[PDB]
Design an enzyme around this catalytic site. Structure first.
Site, PDB file in Angstrom:
ATOM      1  N   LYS A 279       0.788  -1.242   0.000  1.00 45.99           N
ATOM      2  CA  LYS A 279       0.000   0.000   0.000  1.00 45.99           C
ATOM      3  C   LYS A 279       0.819   1.290   0.000  1.00 45.99           C
ATOM      4  O   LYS A 279       0.647   2.194  -0.840  1.00 45.99           O
ATOM      5  CB  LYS A 279      -0.976   0.077   1.161  1.00 45.99           C
ATOM      6  CG  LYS A 279      -0.912   1.442   1.838  1.00 45.99           C
ATOM      7  CD  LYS A 279      -2.241   2.199   1.880  1.00 45.99           C
ATOM      8  CE  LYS A 279      -2.359   3.300   0.819  1.00 45.99           C
ATOM      9  NZ  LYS A 279      -1.206   4.222   0.816  1.00 45.99           N
TER      10      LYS A 279
ATOM     11  N   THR B   9     -13.347  -2.421  -0.229  1.00 44.87           N
ATOM     12  CA  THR B   9     -14.226  -3.313  -1.024  1.00 44.87           C
ATOM     13  C   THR B   9     -13.758  -4.758  -0.899  1.00 44.87           C
ATOM     14  O   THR B   9     -14.512  -5.658  -1.222  1.00 44.87           O
ATOM     15  CB  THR B   9     -14.349  -2.965  -2.530  1.00 44.87           C
ATOM     16  OG1 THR B   9     -13.059  -2.715  -3.040  1.00 44.87           O
ATOM     17  CG2 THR B   9     -15.320  -1.799  -2.846  1.00 44.87           C
TER      18      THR B   9
ATOM     19  N   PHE C  23     -14.303   8.496   4.734  1.00 43.78           N
ATOM     20  CA  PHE C  23     -12.936   8.570   4.277  1.00 43.78           C
ATOM     21  C   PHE C  23     -11.912   9.073   5.311  1.00 43.78           C
ATOM     22  O   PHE C  23     -11.764  10.270   5.586  1.00 43.78           O
ATOM     23  CB  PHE C  23     -12.834   9.269   2.911  1.00 43.78           C
ATOM     24  CG  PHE C  23     -11.522   8.936   2.229  1.00 43.78           C
ATOM     25  CD1 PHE C  23     -11.367   7.733   1.544  1.00 43.78           C
ATOM     26  CD2 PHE C  23     -10.423   9.791   2.337  1.00 43.78           C
ATOM     27  CE1 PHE C  23     -10.151   7.399   0.957  1.00 43.78           C
ATOM     28  CE2 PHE C  23      -9.195   9.473   1.761  1.00 43.78           C
ATOM     29  CZ  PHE C  23      -9.059   8.254   1.110  1.00 43.78           C
TER      30      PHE C  23
ATOM     31  N   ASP D  39      -2.636   7.725   4.302  1.00 35.80           N
ATOM     32  CA  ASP D  39      -2.221   9.024   3.754  1.00 35.80           C
ATOM     33  C   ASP D  39      -3.100   9.449   2.621  1.00 35.80           C
ATOM     34  O   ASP D  39      -3.945   8.709   2.179  1.00 35.80           O
ATOM     35  CB  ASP D  39      -0.808   8.972   3.188  1.00 35.80           C
ATOM     36  CG  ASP D  39      -0.740   8.401   1.803  1.00 35.80           C
ATOM     37  OD1 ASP D  39      -0.819   7.078   1.764  1.00 35.80           O
ATOM     38  OD2 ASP D  39      -0.578   9.105   0.827  1.00 35.80           O
TER      39      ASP D  39
ATOM     40  N   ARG E 190       0.796  12.117   6.658  1.00 38.95           N
ATOM     41  CA  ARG E 190       1.643  11.101   7.184  1.00 38.95           C
ATOM     42  C   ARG E 190       2.091  11.499   8.565  1.00 38.95           C
ATOM     43  O   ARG E 190       2.392  10.625   9.362  1.00 38.95           O
ATOM     44  CB  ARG E 190       2.813  10.767   6.245  1.00 38.95           C
ATOM     45  CG  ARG E 190       2.452   9.924   4.989  1.00 38.95           C
ATOM     46  CD  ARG E 190       3.648   9.418   4.142  1.00 38.95           C
ATOM     47  NE  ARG E 190       3.617   7.959   3.955  1.00 38.95           N
ATOM     48  CZ  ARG E 190       3.094   7.042   4.860  1.00 38.95           C
ATOM     49  NH1 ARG E 190       2.539   7.363   6.064  1.00 38.95           N
ATOM     50  NH2 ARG E 190       3.144   5.735   4.565  1.00 38.95           N
TER      51      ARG E 190
HETATM   52  N1  5GP Z   1      -6.534   6.914   2.787  1.00 36.75           N
HETATM   53  C1  5GP Z   1      -7.452   5.986   2.654  1.00 36.75           C
HETATM   54  N2  5GP Z   1      -7.283   4.967   1.807  1.00 36.75           N
HETATM   55  C2  5GP Z   1      -8.397   4.187   1.735  1.00 36.75           C
HETATM   56  C3  5GP Z   1      -9.571   4.330   2.441  1.00 36.75           C
HETATM   57  N3  5GP Z   1     -10.433   3.282   2.180  1.00 36.75           N
HETATM   58  C4  5GP Z   1      -9.802   2.552   1.299  1.00 36.75           C
HETATM   59  N4  5GP Z   1      -8.590   3.081   0.936  1.00 36.75           N
HETATM   60  C5  5GP Z   1      -7.448   2.714   0.102  1.00 36.75           C
HETATM   61  O1  5GP Z   1      -7.934   2.087  -1.096  1.00 36.75           O
HETATM   62  C6  5GP Z   1      -7.588   0.669  -1.021  1.00 36.75           C
HETATM   63  C7  5GP Z   1      -8.645  -0.214  -1.626  1.00 36.75           C
HETATM   64  O2  5GP Z   1      -8.833  -1.400  -0.851  1.00 36.75           O
HETATM   65  P1  5GP Z   1     -10.044  -2.251  -1.424  1.00 36.75           P
HETATM   66  O3  5GP Z   1     -11.052  -1.254  -1.913  1.00 36.75           O
HETATM   67  O4  5GP Z   1      -9.361  -2.986  -2.518  1.00 36.75           O
HETATM   68  O5  5GP Z   1     -10.493  -3.079  -0.289  1.00 36.75           O
HETATM   69  C8  5GP Z   1      -7.415   0.423   0.436  1.00 36.75           C
HETATM   70  O6  5GP Z   1      -6.693  -0.722   0.560  1.00 36.75           O
HETATM   71  C9  5GP Z   1      -6.599   1.646   0.801  1.00 36.75           C
HETATM   72  O7  5GP Z   1      -5.289   1.569   0.251  1.00 36.75           O
HETATM   73  C10 5GP Z   1      -9.703   5.415   3.331  1.00 36.75           C
HETATM   74  O8  5GP Z   1     -10.618   5.645   4.110  1.00 36.75           O
HETATM   75  N5  5GP Z   1      -8.593   6.251   3.316  1.00 36.75           N
END
Ligand code: 5GP
Ligand code: 5GP
Ligand code: 5GP
Ligand code: 5GP
Lengths: 209, 214, 209, 214
Positions: free
Chosen positions: C65, C130, C178, C185, C191
């Site tokens: 990440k 997701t 969010f 970050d 950060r």
């Molecule tokens: N900064 C941040 N990144 C997020 C947030 N929710 C998801 N993401 C980022 O988007 C990625 C997508 O993960 P996934 O949607 O594949 O489960 C997460 O792993 C993370 O890197 C959030 O609330 N804030």
């Protein structure tokens, strides 16, 4: 065991190898014992302490020097050893008002050690110099017939003027020099400096009043 | 600064005075640099870095042998300093594994095109962090690789640096400590994935050195 | 066990109850998860981890990440559980380059999991949204025939868009909002903020490029 | 600021989610305020204090029931802030045990002449720290005692403050947290010298409350 011995001929570190508050920069001569080293050396101390005192209720007393810090930092580690315990175990915390004031200032005043009769005691001082204070402190804690008495100290200056006291627990044994920092102060200054340093002829000058 | 110097003749400390795991109490010769000591020096270092690098978007690059520890630690001190700015400034963190064989050419998969994300660096301010420089090779081969991307500034930060004849004679910009030609473990440094849990830096003994092996 | 659930209807704390870098003061909406709470909640996580994985060598992998922090903070606690151990036990640390890029990017590239065949694996992500990333990550770590695979995550957003992944270890389960701070970050910003906060419509604006 | 408010209906957290000693796992009802939470609030508070008190010789006075913890902690944050001054400023630390009976007069030994060292305070800037205000009595009787010595400024800092009908209705200057009329233990607060080692603040249960006794 003598703790960590520092030699007479020890140079310490240049003030520049670490973070020293810029406001004490002409006042200090050398860092002698950086903060983190004290920390680790204290972690182990705690351990040697519990080795012989864990298991039963204890009474940790702080000499009223006005240097609570070390006492605290040590109690925190002594507390973290206690959780692993199977049965719960009380521990009582306190300062001893007085340390070479005597007698009936102990029979009552210092007799709230009437509270010490029968209990296991641990005395905590930060630096020992001539030993007077402490020794006059065992005399009286003794009158109380404590069940047992240990004495941990963070620093043990080696001076021709020791009056023979040798604590049970030593963190570091130092030259006879004048230190501040961490948990030692000077007229209420250097409380914000967390390494043990030697003070300079200038520092000791401007700090007084 | 040579960082804190530790002459060849330093004898360390005996196991007895610090906390050490009992399971490695036979695998070490002496405490070389205790954790907290490490800690205080690193705090200094962070200040030192920001002296130079501070006020700008810094790209923190990590040189990835067997760990992460030092870097992580250092960065907490840097972040903590970037708190005070009247202006928010980005930071970029990166990880680069490089131990190829030699180099001896080879293609596309993982090598030259790991520069694609290196253009990321170009007109950038870089900080390379390593944990311990031995021969210094690794370092030397990165500057090269890095310096192509035309960066605005490269600066390297080592926790430790050994005095050895086996050295390509490279010297970081920020040294935590310069040490003698000894094999140490603990804190950040591992030996076959052992000593991960040892916090102080120490010198191994033959038994554990010879007992944990390849 | 779901971890510490935070409700949809959670207000969080006013930005004023803590220390937030003044430079992010119009960018953040609320502190949601203050730094120390994460810390403690993480201390316990480690524990549930060791409960079923202590005892044998393990391989802790970090999703690339670009959020190493949590991984670190967790490894440090997993390391402190390991000392108490009677025999020494290796542990290997690493990042997985890739997380919904597939196939032979795994058979070799991700096959340095050839290195995972036969070993006990622990994957560490910071927030799951997701679930896609992770799920496509077990598919392949799976091809490697790992001996066992657990998945700890610090945050588990509850979204209509979960694609069904439910990690083995959860620190906190959050609304679909969010967040930034601690180990999350935004375009390389936040950060230096160590509480998990909600970002504001403004914050998400100015931070981009 | 009411500090962080915790409505009567707050249910806390179950033991299950945090680290707690097993030997008290029957003596508590729920986690009320976890250690780190405590920590972050205290950091805030320190800033808050220096807002007012900062730049001057401050006399830190400690109100001494059964512990020290909070104070000590708070002070590390203050000291840490006094590092940045372009001028070194003293700090005075003090400890005052006061739980007399009532007051009901009584002489010389320990009471009025514990003001001798109170003239120490006079034209001084004072900060009284307490851990938990219940009825608020203790506090009220100190202000009195203190206010005689003609101080330049008194300000009180509580970690916690309970909502109760049993309250003399005193309200500190700096509150960490205002809580509901519950009996808590841990972190800084003890119950017969038990729970000293518990870090989180929680609500006792009847068993441990009834099991640890007088
Ligand atoms: N900064 C941040 N990144 C997020 C947030 N929710 C998801 N993401 C980022 O988007 C990625 C997508 O993960 P996934 O949607 O594949 O489960 C997460 O792993 C993370 O890197 C959030 O609330 N804030
Ligand atoms: N600041 C500071 N105080 C010291 C030093 N050496 C001794 N003292 C103070 O003077 C006291 C005298 O202790 P004694 O001389 O009775 O052993 C010590 O307990 C300590 O309070 C020193 O190096 N620095
Ligand atoms: N544990 C440990 N690893 C070392 C030591 N010296 C070198 N190594 C490992 O090998 C690398 C040597 O890189 P070089 O600078 O030799 O190219 C170091 O980054 C480190 O990972 C040492 O004394 N102890
Ligand atoms: N453990 C604990 N002690 C308390 C509590 N409330 C009051 N006490 C103790 O009794 C004191 C009450 O002082 P007051 O404000 O009632 O004069 C507190 O400082 C504290 O030491 C509580 O809920 N828990």
């Amino acid at each position: 065991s003598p703790g960590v011995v520092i030699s007479d001929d020890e140079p310490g570190y240049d003030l520049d190898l670490f973070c020293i508050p810029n406001h004490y920069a002409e006042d200090l001569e050398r860092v002698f014992i950086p903060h983190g080293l004290i920390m680790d050396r204290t972690e182990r101390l705690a351990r040697d302490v519990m080795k012989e005192m864990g298991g039963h209720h204890i009474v940790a007393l702080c000499v009223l020097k006005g240097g609570y810090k070390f006492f605290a930092d040590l109690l925190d580690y002594i507390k973290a050893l206690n959780r692993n315990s199977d049965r719960s175990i009380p521990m009582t915390v306190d300062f001893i008002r007085l340390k070479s004031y005597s007698t009936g200032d102990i029979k009552v005043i210092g007799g709230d050690d009437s509270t010490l009769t029968g209990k296991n005691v641990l005395i905590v001082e930060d630096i020992i110099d001539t030993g007077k204070t402490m020794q006059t402190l065992l005399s009286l804690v003794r009158q109380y017939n404590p069940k047992m008495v240990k004495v941990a100290s963070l620093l043990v200056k080696r001076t021709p003027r020791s009056v023979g006291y040798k604590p049970d627990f030593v963190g570091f044994e130092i030259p006879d020099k004048f230190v501040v920092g961490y948990a030692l102060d000077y007229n209420e200054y250097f409380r914000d400096l967390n390494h043990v340093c030697v003070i300079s002829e200038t520092g000791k000058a401007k700090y007084k009043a």
